């Protein structure tokens, strides 16, 4: 261990892996030799592990003051600089104290190095190595759990002692909202006191891995009321707590709740993921065409109003016409766009008949050139939405059903216009809680599109043709390519009846090769 180092040197030197191995070996040997003592109080016992230090680092012409662990991880992540022999710069340094920040750090690297394949490979390598190092450190440091820690804490702190020793004041009538408020405040108090004081589970709750606040509050503090199978609160909430014991009536309530969960799981699995079938079956044919600009009209740009920063998040990597009308990149951090209706390019309005121009896809286009854009859109929509709906069924579910209806039933589309429907879709996406880039949504709308003249050149003129949209199954069955229609359901009327003019319809497609 040395008072100071120059990281630029250790990466440029050939002994980089040697120094890392030496440092790691020293950490493991040292901290395995020592022992951990728990103060079991607000104060901290004297543990003198060398893993925590106050060492220095001279780089970029300045000296940073970091500990031993920060040093080992900083060398472990800065591996690309060594691989490409490029010096590190101050902006390329991040406070590694917060783990989530590592996330951001990784992202920014992918920017200064050109989105190459080699940097992707080295990122995978460093991730794997960091995992292995965490493994060895995790054996050589214990993480056990037992309630004796809780008992000793309660002996040390009487606040926690009486907190665990508490029941509802049943002497008065208690309302549902009141008991929820009191249980919330008690759970927050439990977590606060647990984090404040030293204990054998301090790191557990500070890191947050493997601890759920709700289950913790239920186990130590009182259980709280539970709903009936039909969704009604019981009049007699469980005054006791899981650790303390249970009531026979409470036992019945718990059993009923468990059976409700089992029934809900049964129906949820029976659901079978049916919607993704047709949504993908329709959206999959969409393609991308390498062209600079569709050359669409200015009025073809659809207008969207801003109400919160969430819509700005939905509209990243795109461009808005400015006061001069030039399409400048939208900045989510920017706030001058609050409460403004502005026009944005979109795939649903792109004038390219071959596909979608790179202008409509924005700066994102360069990323996606490898893969079927529409397929990513459909899958990235169907996954979190289904997961959220299924979890909610396990209130917030109603907006999800509303989104399903908007996509399926199509009454709102028959009653309104494209700008209105896309704004409603954005609002529904916000309500649902999932976050997806709006570009994919606009692409689903582009597939949703239906117009009289198959040519998009008219679309580039001042007035757009008819802009009607139908049901998802109807829209796919509308699709003039018969290969995708046959692969769908309802083929009976398609083949034996003339309602859908399947004899008439004809168009090329990807699945057409599959036949």
């Amino acid at each position: 261990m040395e008072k100071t180092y120059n990281l630029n040197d250790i990466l440029l030197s050939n002994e980089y892996e040697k120094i890392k191995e030496d440092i790691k070996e020293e950490i493991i040997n040292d901290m395995a030799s020592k022992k951990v003592k728990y103060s079991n109080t607000s104060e901290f016992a004297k543990n003198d592990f060398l893993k925590d230090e106050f060492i220095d680092l001279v780089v970029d012409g300045e000296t940073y003051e970091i500990t031993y662990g920060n040093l080992i991880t900083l060398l472990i992540v800065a591996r690309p600089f060594n691989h490409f022999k490029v010096p590190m710069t101050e902006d390329l340094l991040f406070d590694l104290s917060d783990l989530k920040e590592y996330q951001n750090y990784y992202t920014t690297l992918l920017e200064h190095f050109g989105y190459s394949n080699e940097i992707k490979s080295i990122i995978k390598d460093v991730i794997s190595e960091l995992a292995i190092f965490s493994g060895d450190i995790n054996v050589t440091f214990g993480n056990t759990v037992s309630i004796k820690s809780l008992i000793d804490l309660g002996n040390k702190v009487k606040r926690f002692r009486e907190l665990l020793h508490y029941r509802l004041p049943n002497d008065e009538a208690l309302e549902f909202n009141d008991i929820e408020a009191i249980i919330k405040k008690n759970l927050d108090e439990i977590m606060k006191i647990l984090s404040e004081t030293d204990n054998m589970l301090r790191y557990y709750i500070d890191s947050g891995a493997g601890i759920n606040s709700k289950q913790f509050g239920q186990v130590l503090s009182l259980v709280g009321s539970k709903p009936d199978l039909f969704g009604k609160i019981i009049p007699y909430p469980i005054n006791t707590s899981f650790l303390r014991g249970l009531d026979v009536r409470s036992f019945y309530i718990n059993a009923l709740g468990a059976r409700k969960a089992l029934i809900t799981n049964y129906q949820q699995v029976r659901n079978s993921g049916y919607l993704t079938r047709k949504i993908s079956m329709l959206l999959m044919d969409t393609k991308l065409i390498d062209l600079d600009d569709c050359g669409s009209h200015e009025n073809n740009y659809l207008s969207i109003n801003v109400e919160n920063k969430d819509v700005l998040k939905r509209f990243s990597k795109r461009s808005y016409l400015n006061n001069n009308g030039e399409l400048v990149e939208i900045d989510i951090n920017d706030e001058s766009l609050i409460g403004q209706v502005i026009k944005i390019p979109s795939p649903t309005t792109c004038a390219s008949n071959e596909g979608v121009c790179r202008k409509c896809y924005g700066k994102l286009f360069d990323i996606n050139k490898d893969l079927n854009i529409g397929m990513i859109a459909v899958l990235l929509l169907t996954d979190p939405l289904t997961q959220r709906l299924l979890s909610a069924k396990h209130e917030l579910s109603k907006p999800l059903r509303e989104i399903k209806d908007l996509i399926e039933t199509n009454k709102y589309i028959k009653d309104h216009n494209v700008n209105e429907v896309v704004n409603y879709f954005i609002y529904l996406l916000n309500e649902s809680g999932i976050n997806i880039q709006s570009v994919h949504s606009e692409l689903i709308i582009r597939e949703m599109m239906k117009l009289d003249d198959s040519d998009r050149t008219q679309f580039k003129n001042d007035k757009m043709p008819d802009y009607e949209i139908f049901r998802i199954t109807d829209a796919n069955l509308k699709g003039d390519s018969l290969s995708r229609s046959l692969l769908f359901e309802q083929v009976k009327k398609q083949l034996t009846t003339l309602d859908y003019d399947t004899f008439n319809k004809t168009k090329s497609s990807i699945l057409d090769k599959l036949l």
């Binding site: 996330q103 992202t107 992918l110 991730i127 995992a131 965490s134 450190i137 440091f141 890191s207 997806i436």
Partner: protein, 89 residues
């Protein structure tokens, strides 16, 4: 990316062993658990096929096709998050 393009690295020597080893960080991307899931393997032979499916390698999925950042599914899972926290803090 519920399909992965993976490369064999080691043949298990123990005859009675019949389970497929897999690194922990791939658990989230393919949405599985060690509880008893049954997963399917399709070998690939043609070299041109290898090149074409290289786009299905996990390194490709490392970039988020949603937002273009580092993918959270390949981020460190629970236990390693804990351990690195011990090392740092």
């Amino acid at each position: 990316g519920s399909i992965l393009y993976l490369k064999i690295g080691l043949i298990k020597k123990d005859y009675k062993d019949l389970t497929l080893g897999i690194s922990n960080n791939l658990l989230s991307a393919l949405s599985g658990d060690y509880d008893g899931d049954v997963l399917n393997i399709i070998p690939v032979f043609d070299n041109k096929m290898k090149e074409h499916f290289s786009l299905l390698s996990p390194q490709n999925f490392l970039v988020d096709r949603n937002n273009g950042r580092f993918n959270g599914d390949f981020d460190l899972q629970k236990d390693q998050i804990l351990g690195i926290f011990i090392l740092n803090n």
